[PDB]
Design a protein around this ligand. Sequence first.
Ligand code: FES
Ligand code: FES
Ligand code: FES
Ligand SMILES: [Fe+3]
Ligand SMILES: [Fe+3]
Lengths: 340, 314, 334
Amino acid sequence: ATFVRNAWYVAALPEELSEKPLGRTILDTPLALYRQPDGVVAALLDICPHRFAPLSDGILVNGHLQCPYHGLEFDGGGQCVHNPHGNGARPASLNVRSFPVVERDALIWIWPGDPALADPGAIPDFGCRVDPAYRTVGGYGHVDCNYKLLVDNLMDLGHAQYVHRANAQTDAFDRLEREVIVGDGEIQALMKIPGGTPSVLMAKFLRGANTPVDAWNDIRWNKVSAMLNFIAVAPEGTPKEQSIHSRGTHILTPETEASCHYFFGSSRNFGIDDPEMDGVLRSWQAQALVKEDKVVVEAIERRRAYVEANGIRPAMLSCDEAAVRVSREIEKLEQLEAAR
Amino acid sequence: ATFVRNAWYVAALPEELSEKPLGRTILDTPLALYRQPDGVVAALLDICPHRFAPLSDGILVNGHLQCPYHGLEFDGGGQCVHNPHGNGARPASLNVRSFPVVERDALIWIWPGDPALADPGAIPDFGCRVDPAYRTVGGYGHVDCNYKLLVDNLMDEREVIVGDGEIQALMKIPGGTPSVLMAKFLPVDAWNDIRWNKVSAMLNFIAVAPEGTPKEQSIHSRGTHILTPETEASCHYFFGSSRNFGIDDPEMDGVLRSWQAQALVKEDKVVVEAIERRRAYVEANGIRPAMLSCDEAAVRVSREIEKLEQLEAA
Amino acid sequence: ATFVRNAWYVAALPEELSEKPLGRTILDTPLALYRQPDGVVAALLDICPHRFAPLSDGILVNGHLQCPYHGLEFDGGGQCVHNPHGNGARPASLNVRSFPVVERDALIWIWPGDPALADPGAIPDFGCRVDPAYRTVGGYGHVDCNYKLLVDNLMDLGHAQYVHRANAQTDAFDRLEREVIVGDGEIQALMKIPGGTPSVLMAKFPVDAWNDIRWNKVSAMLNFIAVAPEGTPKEQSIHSRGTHILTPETEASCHYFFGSSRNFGIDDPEMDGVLRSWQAQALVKEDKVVVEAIERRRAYVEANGIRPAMLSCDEAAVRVSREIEKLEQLEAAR
Ligand code: FES
Ligand code: FES
Ligand code: FES
Ligand SMILES: [Fe+3]
Ligand SMILES: [Fe+3]
């Protein structure tokens, strides 16, 4: 598998983690992820340097992760801090690899490449997730596809018109206005849907109001595979910036070449103290993201062998510009990294 | 990934198909099989030309299959007939592969190979299946073995008659014994014949009459036994019978629709699936099967298949 | 992948075998194992020479294994003895491979390698299993690891302080002493565990305990777990001699034959229960979970050239591992 290792990836949502380790593989690298007694998250290679047992099946002893096999103890920097055996000697050979972690924007970011190069300034901005003006709900999904298929999915949100038609179909789809803005390490795909009846989802945002609206569904990509969308709806002619909206976290992290982790969320500026609106967004996430999109991209992954064996290449449509530009940027990053 | 692609295979029974597409893989080729509003069956490659979504997860829009991902619509010839996006242009690059398909003898026949060579006149004759003189019932099953194993099993006064892409194994038993099924409709002759056509389509003839009687006027069933490879190690099995006895008996219909009664009893499925699991060992150790006297027809068939494979190798 | 094929392996416990065949794969070789009416065990390649059906799914007819598919019948030497078809001729091509088998010490040993070379004198000694002075209970487990991982597990029995902490803990761990003695195709790790409080298990039979293990090539081990009052001679201890015998199934899976042969409470059903409970919990659950997890990490370890870092407890396991690697490479280079 080719992955871009010198980049930050979301490995977990903070609420997934505790003093009980979580074993999760990112970029074909098995990790043991836990929150220490002092609250700091650690990420260790989930392979004990002694005989390769899963540290993730161990427990904390004195805030130190104890290997379940012969009881070596490790701190969050991977240092072996206790060896129960013989003279108890702890040479550097017993230290386990530790991965840089930044807990930011209610995300656990990990750097899986050269730890010397881990630069917190490179972490994409998802500040809305911790902004008290936004209400955020979301979760985790596992998907049996190459993460690039879900990047493709997200970078053409037009797919919602079909894949999510029961919730997302608009009668103004024929009048979509698209632009693509290309920045440095960042690409935006903008979509405005002018003058339509609100979709079923947008009508729920508005609490049933069914008169004509403008809607937007923009998305921002940052390398490698972190996206933030803007789903918004307002009375015709009222500015974007004044709209009720959800900024959607859509972040992918490769697991294996043919599987990935999907971290999703909605950060909304409306109905902030409304458990029933929470439910609308959670049920949307459960149906759209973890069911419908999964089913499409997992089917596409199953067709990979045929496509490759037969030299089949995708045929592009007018809606693909942003997805293609992103795909080419990822490929470029992949090749740059394969040189190092 | 060794198949004989240049041949007609059954992909479905007609009763499986409707305006809701069926996704089924034959010879490692995923198909979307559906009936258009005019009744006519279409068979498209189950891979959208845009981004490779399963067209079989789509629905018809004005009789045209719509990709479930971004809404490209296709006709039964695979032509893209609507592009929702932008200027709506439909360059030839948006067309999807369509397979030669013939509905005949209550079977859906598909040609997975070189479409230039697909001659509908070469489709095997299963006419009994739509002959009103016969009551025809049957069904479908899936098996986790190479189809050749089931062909071998099927093909096991004798005579074996060998022709070009057809082989017949005939057996007559004078003073023979009615099958349990037929006994009650009767000093008998019995017949058990089977006909193979390339690659894996068989029709048997199981019959009993008073001695003397033209086997053509016997009490008899003609059994449909048609295999289609799914992967190298799995197959589809279409079975059925066309009978001239008890034609209005629904209980008889029932037992003749049973997979285990008519096609493959569980104990034999266990055996053939186990044989498939021994393939790796057999190949690694250069082990070849040892044939018995009962294998004569199966061997002849096996050799013809291998020749057809070898042709396609280049 | 690479196995030591020229060696005896346990393929079954005798109690697993009957006139109903058992299909089991050893060293990537599928076998049909059964007991003939005269009591003699046969082991045939589980691939009918006709069309490759599992003979192990058939039954015996007049003491002969009958293929379930078209009913060829075979004797214990693999000779085809009946062909129900045609003239019933039995050409030599119908015979099936039969493997050398020795039933000894309440074990079924099979030689999967060059049959010219199978010397029954080479089978290691597990005589306690049929010694009237000992009571033996045990069984079979399947494990999704390469057998060498479970050899490691068994040869460093100081994982029991952690993996088996609920049953096997003892404070005296601080003060382990462990002696490795190397012999010819045989390695032992010995151990006094002195003056200590007994582990939960020991209590179920201040104490001295011992926990020795003997390995013989390829992967056959017998341990010695013993406790006695402080100051008591190792040899007057109540003890269990543990059968711990591994046989490769595939590159990444194995068969585990375990047993306890004890010299105490030998008429006592409650003790049977303590031992069978330990075997169930320790060997088939806890150790299984660890080694199966390590197996899953193999791809990463190999891809990244990672080598193990050894501790003071590892000598015996390392010596054994070196001997197996040596046998494995000695064979593949011929
Ligand atoms: S494998 Fe971790 S201490 Fe031995
Ligand atoms: S994958 Fe079919 S329209 Fe996009
Ligand atoms: S496969 Fe055993 S008798 Fe035919
Ligand atoms: Fe979606
Ligand atoms: Fe253990």
